[PDB]
C-alpha cells in the first residue's frame, strides 16, 4: 500500500521542496502558471447526484475553490462560500479533477454548491461574480503542457549500454521493458536480471558508447561482433543527457586532464552515504575515467573500479569534505583521527588532482535543509521513498530517508535524476515507501 | 516543371517576406537563430571523391561557408577561401546538407577544400581559426526543431467535415488521403472528387461540428445517425482564433442578427469584397451569410458560413474607408455605390462597429514583397506572388504575370501564403509567372 | 550648407543602416517600439490657421499619418485620407512634431484635415474610426525616452586625460568646452588647441588614469603631485566606457599576456585606412600596452608609440589581413607584393603574439555592404560625413566616404562610437558633410 503524504501535509510548517527545484520533474517549466490565491473548478465531495450526468462522461460534480498552499504537487483547496477552514482539503494538482474556471460550462455541466453552504443563496451568480471577477485561474492548455512533460525520451524495446550492477567496472547490453515516470526498467541480456534507472541517469549509455570510449563491455556475441566491425532499436546519443558535448573533445577523444594515479574525493557508487578518497586507475576517452574508492579492501582484479566522467558533479578535489565540514570516509588503514590529506599523500607518495580539473557551478537550486521530497533508493531502485534534505553543500545534497538510520543516507547532486517533488509518485503512478514503523 | 526563384534572387533589391512573417510556416519560431554573417558547414560541390566514406553515412564531403543573404528559406552561401564571389551559390536552407561548424569532426569527417582553391594552403588550420574564431554558427538542435515543425497535426485516414465546394451552404464528410506541407487533400465520402486546403483552414471541422453548431450536413446515413470512432478528426486538431469558453454552454449568441448587413470576401471569388447579409445565425458565433452581388436565389444553396471573429468579414464602409473598389450588390454600380443609399433602398441596417474586433499586428508584410501563394480557386496550385497592397492586417496578393483581376484578398495570418522557397521545402510544385507571348 | 539626405531617400532601394545597428545612438534601446504601418499624429502642412491656438502652446495643427518607411532616423509619412502618394513626406522622426494618436485630444486640440482632402467628409469620425481602430501607435513615453538618451554623461568644465594629437605616446590634461551629440570638444590645458571625440572613445580617460596605468602624462606640476583628494571638476571612472572591469586583473595590475617584442597587426592610429604589422614596445598595467606601427619611418624617440588595450577591437593577430583578403601595409622597407609574415619574422628574428591572446567575438551587428550612414573623419573629427559600408570583415567595417577616393576609407569596428545612423546630424545639430563636387 502506497504512502499518502496527507499526515505530513496536515502539519503546520510542513516544508516541501517546490516542483521548480527539480528541472527534470513533470510540470517544472510551466509551474509559474500556478499561484496561491488562484481559483479553480474542483470536485464537490459534499453533494447529491442532482446533476444529470451524460453516461460515459465524468460522474463528478464540481464547485469552485481557492488555492491556499502549494507543497510540491500538492495544493490546499478552500471551497468558495465557506466561512471557516473546516472543509479545506488537499489535492494532487495533476491527478484530481482540477480545472480552469469555465471548464464545466463549456461541457454543459452546472456548478453545484457543497451541502454545508447550499442554502446561503438561491442564485449563486452575484456571489460567484463577486469572488471570481478579475481573479486568476488556470491557462486552458495547462494539462496539455503537463502531459507533454510526462513522456519519456525512450520507448519500450530500445537497446542500451548500462553499468552492470553485479560488476560495476563494465557496462552490459540491456533492453527497456517497462517505463514508469521516466524511470526505465532495464533487463540485461544473457540473464534474467535487471534494475530501474531514470532516463537522465549517468550510468546508461547509447549503443556503441563502451567501444568508442574504451569502457569494458559485456554483451551477446552478435553485438560484440558489430562493435568491432545502427539498428532500429538502438538507443542513440540524442536520447541521453550529458552536461557536455562531444564537440568539446577531439575526434579521437584523447584527453590531457586527469592522469592515472591522481587522487581525489568521490561519492562511493556502492555506498552513497560515503564520500571517500579515490584514485584514478585508468583514463579512457572523451573525459571518462575509471576510479577506485580507497576505503575498499585491496583488489587487483579491478572488478570494483567505477567510471566517472571528468565533469561529474559526484567527484571532488582532495580536501572537499574538510573544506565543507563533511566527515570524510577515511582510506583503508586510517581513522577519522589519523587521517589528513597531507599525511595520506606523503604515505602513498601520490599527487592530488588540481582544483582546475574540476568544474562546478553552483545554481540557485532552492533546496534547503529540512525540505521534504521523494527519493529513489539507489541500492534498490524499485523503491522511491519519503525523504528529507539533511545537508546542502554548494550544489551537493545529502538526502535522508525518514524513519531509517543515517547509514542509508545518499549524497546526490542537486540536479540528480533520482529526486522528485512531494506528490511525484501519485502523479506517475509509482508506489511511495513511507517511513518504517518503529517496533518499540 | 516547377518554377525556380533564382532569376529573382539574382537581382539586386529582391524583397522577399522573411519566414518570420508566416506564423504557420516551418521554422518560424526558431528562425531568429539564423543571421547574415554566420558560418556553417555545407556540401562541397567542387571536390574529387578523396574522402573515405563510412557505410550508412552521407557520401557528401563538406567545407565551410558564410551566409551572405537570406530570402525566405533561400540563403546565399560563400565558401571560405575564395578571392571572388564568382562561386557564391544559393541553397535551400532546410533541404541542403547544412550543419553547425563542428558537426563533421564529431563524426570523424574531415573538411575538404573545393578544388578551385585547394592549393592555397597545405594545412588550412591557421586560415580557418582566423576566419571562424568568435563567429556565429547554428545551434546544434536547429534542424531537429525544423523537422518537428514540418509535421501536420493530421494523418492519412482521418475523417472530417468540410465545406461542400458544389454547395457551400453545407459541409460534407471527407477523408484525408494526402498531405503536402500540411496542405491536406480531402476526398468526399460519396465521390472521387475533393479539394486541397491547409490544415489551419477555417473551412474544415471536426466530426460532430455541423450538428453541434447547427450547420447543414451532407454525410452517410449511419454517420448522420451517430451525430444525432478511431478515424474521427477531433476538436484539438483544428485551429480557432477563439475558445468555446467565450460562449454560453448552448452557444446562443446575441451579437449578429438576421438581416444585418456587412462586408465580406466572396468565398466564390477571393478577388472580391462585397456587401453581404446575415441569413441565419447559428451557434457559438457561426453564421450563414449571403454575398449581395450574387444573382437572385431563394434556395439558400449559396449561403456561406463565416464565424463572427473571421478576419474576412468587415463592417459596412470598410472598402470605402480603405480606398477599395467594392463589388456592388446585384443591380448596382461600383464607383457610385453608397451604404447610405443602399440601406435606404433595402430598409436594412448595418451591423454595428462594436460587433467586429479587428486588431492590426505588426505583421511585417510590405508592398512589393515576394512570396508563394495558393490559388484559392484552384488550391492544387501554389504560385509566385507579390504583396500588392497592405490594408491594415488585410493583404491584396497579386499573382506575378497575371492581371490584377486575379488578385486575392488574404488576411496577414492566412494559412494559404508561404515564404519564398516553401514549395521546394515541402516538395510542392511552384507555378511561375506565365510567359509574355508578345 | 549641411547636406540633406532628401534626394537619396527619394530614390528607390536606398539602404540605410537602422538605428538599432548603433548601440550608442540615441533611441537605439526603444527603437523597436516603432514600426512601418503604425499611426501617428503629425503636423498638418496643408491647412489654413483655422484652429484656435492657446497662447504658450504649439501653433501647429495636426492630422494623422501612417509610417511607410524608416531609414535611420528618417520616416516616410502618408496622411490618412489621401488616395495617392503625391503628398507623402519625409520627416526627422526625433525632431519633427510627432505624437501618439490621442495626444491632441488630451490637450483639447482638434485634428484638422489637409485642404486637399477636406471635402471628402463633413464629419471625419467614421473614416478615422475605420482607419485607426486596432492599429498601432506610439507609446506615450517614447519621446521622453528619446530625450533621456540624448544626454551626454559629461558636462562642461570637466577635466580629463586624453591622447595628445601632437604626441600620441602621452596623454594630456584637457577640459570639455563643448558638447554636440555626445561628441566632446576637449581643449588642452596649456593651449588653445584641442580636438573632438565621442564620449565613448577609447582615447579619453579619467583623472588619475595615466598614473594608475603607467602611461606617459603631460600635466602641470600641481596635478602630478596630486596623483602621486578629488577635485569637483574631475572626470571620474564611471563616466568612461570600458569593455572590461578591473576585477579581471590583480590589484597591482600586473599582467602576463602580451610581452615586449611580440608582433601583431593593428589599425594605424595616424592612418585609419591602414592595417599594419605592429610591435609591443611597452607593457603597462591593467591590460594596456604601447605599440609602434612598423610602417613608420625609424624613430628611437618613441614619441609615435600608441596605447591600445589588450581587448581593443583594433588589434589583430599576425596574418589577419592575409586571412581576410585585406591589403596589408608593409613594414618600413618592404613591398606589398613581396612581404610575408614568415619572411618578416625571419628578418627581424621576432615572435608573433599567439591567437589565444586575442579574443574577438563577432556579434550579429546587422551592418551590410552598401548601407548608408554618417561617419566621423577620425583625422579631422570636426567632420561627420556621408558614408557607406564598403566591406564587412567579421565585426570590422571598411567605411567609405561617398564621392571620395578609397584612400580615405576607414577601418572601423562595428561598435565604434564614430559611426551614426542616417539623420543623426539633423537630430544632434551637427553639420553633415556631403559628397564633394
Amino acid at each position: 500500500h502506497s504512502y499518502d503524504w496527507l499526515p505530513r501535509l496536515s502539519k503546520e510548517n510542513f516544508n516541501a521542496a517546490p516542483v521548480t527545484c527539480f528541472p527534470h520533474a513533470p510540470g517544472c517549466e510551466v509551474w509559474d502558471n500556478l499561484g496561491v490565491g488562484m481559483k479553480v473548478e474542483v470536485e464537490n465531495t459534499d453533494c447529491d447526484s442532482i446533476e444529470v450526468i451524460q453516461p460515459g462522461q465524468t460522474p463528478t460534480s464540481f464547485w469552485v475553490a481557492t488555492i491556499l498552499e502549494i507543497k510540491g504537487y500538492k495544493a490546499l483547496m478552500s471551497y468558495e462560500g465557506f466561512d471557516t477552514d473546516s472543509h479545506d482539503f488537499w489535492v494532487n494538482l495533476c491527478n484530481a479533477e482540477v480545472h480552469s474556471v469555465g471548464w464545466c460550462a463549456t461541457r454543459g455541466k452546472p456548478l453545484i454548491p457543497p451541502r454545508t453552504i447550499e442554502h446561503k443563496y438561491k442564485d449563486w451568480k452575484d456571489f460567484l461574480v463577486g469572488r471570481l471577477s478579475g481573479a486568476r485561474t488556470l491557462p486552458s492548455n495547462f494539462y496539455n503542457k503537463i502531459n507533454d512533460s510526462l513522456q519519456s525520451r525512450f520507448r519500450l524495446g530500445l537497446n542500451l549500454e548500462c553499468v552492470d550492477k553485479d560488476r560495476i567496472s563494465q557496462v552490459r547490453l540491456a533492453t527497456v521493458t517497462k517505463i514508469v515516470g521516466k524511470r526505465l526498467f532495464l533487463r540485461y541480456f544473457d540473464s534474467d536480471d535487471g534494475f530501474w534507472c531514470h532516463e537522465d541517469s549517468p550510468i546508461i549509455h547509447p549503443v556503441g558508447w563502451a567501444t568508442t570510449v574504451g569502457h569494458n563491455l559485456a554483451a551477446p556475441q552478435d553485438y560484440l561482433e558489430r562493435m568491432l566491425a545502427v539498428h532500429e532499436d538502438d538507443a542513440t546519443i540524442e536520447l541521453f543527457k550529458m552536461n557536455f558535448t562531444f564537440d568539446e573533445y577531439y575526434s579521437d577523444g584523447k584527453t590531457n586532464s586527469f592522469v592515472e594515479g591522481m587522487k581525489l574525493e568521490a561519492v562511493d557508487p556502492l555506498n552513497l552515504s560515503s564520500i571517500c578518497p579515490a584514485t584514478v586507475m585508468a583514463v579512457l576517452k572523451f573525459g571518462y575515467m575509471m576510479i577506485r574508492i580507497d576505503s575498499y579492501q585491496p583488489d587487483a582484479s579491478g572488478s570494483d573500479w567505477f567510471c566517472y566522467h571528468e565533469k561529474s558533479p559526484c567527484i571532488f578535489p582532495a580536501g572537499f569534505c574538510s573544506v565543507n565540514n563533511i566527515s570524510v570516509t577515511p582510506p583503508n588503514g586510517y581513522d577519522s583521527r589519523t587521517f589528513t590529506w597531507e599525511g595520506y599523500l606523503r604515505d602513498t607518495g601520490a599527487v592530488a588532482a588540481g582544483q582546475h580539473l574540476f568544474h562546478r557551478i553552483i545554481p540557485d537550486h532552492g533546496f534547503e535543509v529540512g525540505m521534504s521530497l521523494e527519493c529513489a533508493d539507489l541500492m534498490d531502485p524499485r523503491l522511491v521513498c519519503v525523504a528529507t534534505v539533511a545537508r546542502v553543500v554548494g550544489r551537493l545534497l545529502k538526502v535522508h530517508f525518514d524513519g531509517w538510520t543515517d547509514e542509508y543516507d545518499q549524497w546526490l547532486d542537486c540536479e540528480s535524476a533520482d529526486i522528485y517533488p512531494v506528490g511525484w509518485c501519485v502523479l506517475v503512478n509509482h508506489k511511495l515507501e513511507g517511513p518504517p514503523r518503529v517496533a518499540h | 516543371h516547377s518554377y525556380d526563384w533564382l532569376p529573382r534572387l539574382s537581382k539586386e533589391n529582391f524583397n522577399a517576406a522573411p519566414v518570420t512573417c508566416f506564423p504557420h510556416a516551418p521554422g518560424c519560431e526558431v528562425w531568429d537563430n539564423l543571421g547574415v554573417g554566420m558560418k556553417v558547414e555545407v556540401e562541397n560541390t567542387d571536390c574529387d571523391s578523396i574522402e573515405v566514406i563510412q557505410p550508412g553515412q552521407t557520401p557528401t564531403s563538406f567545407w565551410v561557408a558564410t551566409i551572405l543573404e537570406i530570402k525566405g528559406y533561400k540563403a546565399l552561401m560563400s565558401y571560405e577561401g575564395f578571392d571572388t564571389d564568382s562561386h557564391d551559390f544559393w541553397v535551400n536552407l532546410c533541404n541542403a546538407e547544412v550543419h553547425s561548424v563542428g558537426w563533421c569532426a564529431t563524426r570523424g569527417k574531415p573538411l575538404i577544400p573545393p578544388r578551385t582553391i585547394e592549393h592555397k594552403y597545405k594545412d588550412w588550420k591557421d586560415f580557418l581559426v582566423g576566419r571562424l574564431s568568435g563567429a556565429r554558427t547554428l545551434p546544434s538542435n536547429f534542424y531537429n526543431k525544423i523537422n518537428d515543425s514540418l509535421q501536420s497535426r493530421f494523418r492519412l485516414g482521418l475523417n472530417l467535415e468540410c465545406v461542400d465546394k458544389d454547395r457551400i451552404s453545407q459541409v460534407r464528410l471527407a477523408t484525408v488521403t494526402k498531405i503536402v506541407g500540411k496542405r491536406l487533400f480531402l476526398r468526399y465520402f460519396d465521390s472521387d472528387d475533393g479539394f486541397w486546403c491547409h490544415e489551419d483552414s477555417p473551412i474544415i471541422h471536426p466530426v460532430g461540428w455541423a450538428t453541434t453548431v447547427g450547420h447543414n450536413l451532407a454525410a452517410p446515413q449511419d454517420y448522420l445517425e451517430r451525430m444525432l470512432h478511431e478515424d474521427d478528426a477531433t476538436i484539438e486538431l483544428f485551429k480557432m482564433n477563439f475558445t468555446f469558453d467565450e460562449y454560453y454552454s448552448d452557444g446562443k449568441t446575441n451579437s449578429f442578427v438576421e438581416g444585418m448587413k456587412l462586408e465580406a470576401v466572396d468565398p466564390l471569388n477571393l478577388s472580391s469584397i462585397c456587401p453581404a447579409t446575415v441569413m441565419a445565425v447559428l451557434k457559438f458565433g457561426y453564421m450563414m451569410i449571403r454575398i449581395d452581388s450574387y444573382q437572385p436565389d431563394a434556395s439558400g444553396s449559396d449561403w456561406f458560413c463565416y464565424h463572427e471573429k473571421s478576419p474576412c468579414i468587415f463592417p459596412a464602409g470598410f472598402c470605402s474607408v480603405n480606398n477599395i473598389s467594392v463589388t456592388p450588390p446585384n443591380g448596382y454600380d461600383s464607383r457610385t455605390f453608397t451604404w447610405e443609399g443602399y440601406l435606404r433602398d433595402t430598409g436594412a441596417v448595418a451591423a454595428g462597429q462594436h460587433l467586429f474586433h479587428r486588431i492590426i499586428p505588426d505583421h511585417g508584410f510590405e508592398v512589393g514583397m515576394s512570396l508563394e501563394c495558393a490559388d484559392l480557386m484552384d488550391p492544387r496550385l501554389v504560385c509566385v506572388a507579390t504583396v500588392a497592397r497592405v490594408v491594415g492586417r488585410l493583404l491584396k496578393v497579386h499573382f506575378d504575370g497575371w492581371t490584377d483581376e486575379y488578385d486575392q484578398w488574404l488576411d496577414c495570418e492566412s494559412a494559404d501564403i508561404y515564404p519564398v522557397g516553401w514549395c521546394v521545402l515541402v516538395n510542392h510544385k511552384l507555378e511561375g509567372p506565365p510567359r509574355v507571348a508578345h | 550648407h549641411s547636406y540633406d539626405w532628401l534626394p537619396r531617400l527619394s530614390k528607390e532601394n536606398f539602404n540605410a543602416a537602422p538605428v538599432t545597428c548603433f548601440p550608442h545612438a540615441p533611441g537605439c534601446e526603444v527603437w523597436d517600439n516603432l514600426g512601418v504601418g503604425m499611426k501617428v499624429e503629425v503636423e498638418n502642412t496643408d491647412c489654413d490657421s483655422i484652429e484656435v491656438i492657446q497662447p504658450g502652446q504649439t501653433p501647429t495643427s495636426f492630422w494623422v499619418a501612417t509610417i511607410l518607411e524608416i531609414k535611420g532616423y528618417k520616416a516616410l509619412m502618408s496622411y490618412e485620407g489621401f488616395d495617392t502618394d503625391s503628398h507623402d513626406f519625409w520627416v526627422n522622426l526625433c525632431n519633427a512634431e510627432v505624437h501618439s494618436v490621442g495626444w491632441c485630444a488630451t490637450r483639447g486640440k482638434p485634428l484638422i484635415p489637409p485642404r486637399t482632402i477636406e471635402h471628402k467628409y463633413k464629419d471625419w469620425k467614421d473614416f478615422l474610426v475605420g482607419r485607426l481602430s486596432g492599429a498601432r501607435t506610439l507609446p506615450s513615453n517614447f519621446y521622453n525616452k528619446i530625450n533621456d538618451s540624448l544626454q551626454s554623461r559629461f558636462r562642461l568644465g570637466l577635466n580629463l586625460e586624453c591622447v595628445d594629437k601632437d604626441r600620441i605616446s602621452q596623454v594630456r590634461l584637457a577640459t570639455v568646452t563643448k558638447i554636440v551629440g555626445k561628441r566632446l570638444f576637449l581643449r588642452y590645458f596649456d593651449s588653445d588647441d584641442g580636438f573632438w571625440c565621442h564620449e565613448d572613445s577609447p582615447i579619453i580617460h579619467p583623472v588619475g588614469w595615466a598614473t594608475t596605468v603607467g602611461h606617459n602624462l603631460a600635466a602641470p606640476q600641481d596635478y602630478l603631485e596630486r596623483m602621486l583628494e578629488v577635485h569637483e571638476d574631475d572626470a571620474t571612472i564611471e563616466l568612461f566606457k570600458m569593455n572590461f572591469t578591473f576585477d579581471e586583473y590583480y590589484s597591482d595590475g600586473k599582467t602576463n599576456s602580451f610581452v615586449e617584442g611580440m608582433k601583431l597587426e593593428a589599425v594605424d592610429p595616424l592612418n585609419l585606412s591602414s592595417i599594419c604589422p605592429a610591435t609591443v614596445m611597452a607593457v603597462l598595467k591593467f591590460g594596456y600596452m604601447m605599440i609602434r606601427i612598423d610602417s613608420y619611418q625609424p624613430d628611437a624617440s618613441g614619441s609615435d608609440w600608441f596605447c591600445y588595450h589588450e581587448k581593443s577591437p583594433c588589434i589583430f593577430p599576425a596574418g589577419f589581413c592575409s586571412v581576410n583578403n585585406i591589403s596589408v601595409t608593409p613594414p618600413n622597407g618592404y613591398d606589398s607584393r613581396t612581404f610575408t609574415w614568415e619572411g618578416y619574422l625571419r628578418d627581424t628574428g621576432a615572435v608573433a603574439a599567439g591567437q589565444h591572446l586575442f579574443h574577438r567575438i563577432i556579434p550579429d551587428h546587422g551592418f551590410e555592404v552598401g548601407m548608408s550612414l554618417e561617419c566621423a573623419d577620425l583625422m579631422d573629427p570636426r567632420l561627420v560625413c556621408v558614408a557607406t559600408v564598403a566591406r564587412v570583415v567579421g565585426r570590422l567595417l571598411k567605411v567609405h566616404f561617398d564621392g571620395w577616393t578609397d584612400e580615405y576609407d576607414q577601418w572601423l569596428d562595428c561598435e565604434s562610437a564614430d559611426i551614426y545612423p542616417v539623420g543623426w546630424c539633423v537630430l544632434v545639430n551637427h553639420k553633415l558633410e556631403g559628397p564633394p563636387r
Binding site: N33, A105, L111, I112, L128, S140 | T243, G364 | R136
Partner: peptide, 30 residues
C-alpha cells in the same frame, strides 16, 4: 513582431448553475 504572446491574458469564461448561466472575466498566465 511586437504583437505576440503575452506573459498573462484576460479570459472570458462562463459558469452554469441550476438557476442559470453567466459570464465572468478572469485572467491566466500565458
Amino acid at each position: 513582431g511586437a504583437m505576440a504572446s503575452r506573459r498573462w491574458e484576460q479570459k472570458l469564461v462562463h459558469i452554469k448553475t441550476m438557476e442559470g448561466e453567466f459570464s465572468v472575466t478572469m485572467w491566466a498566465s500565458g
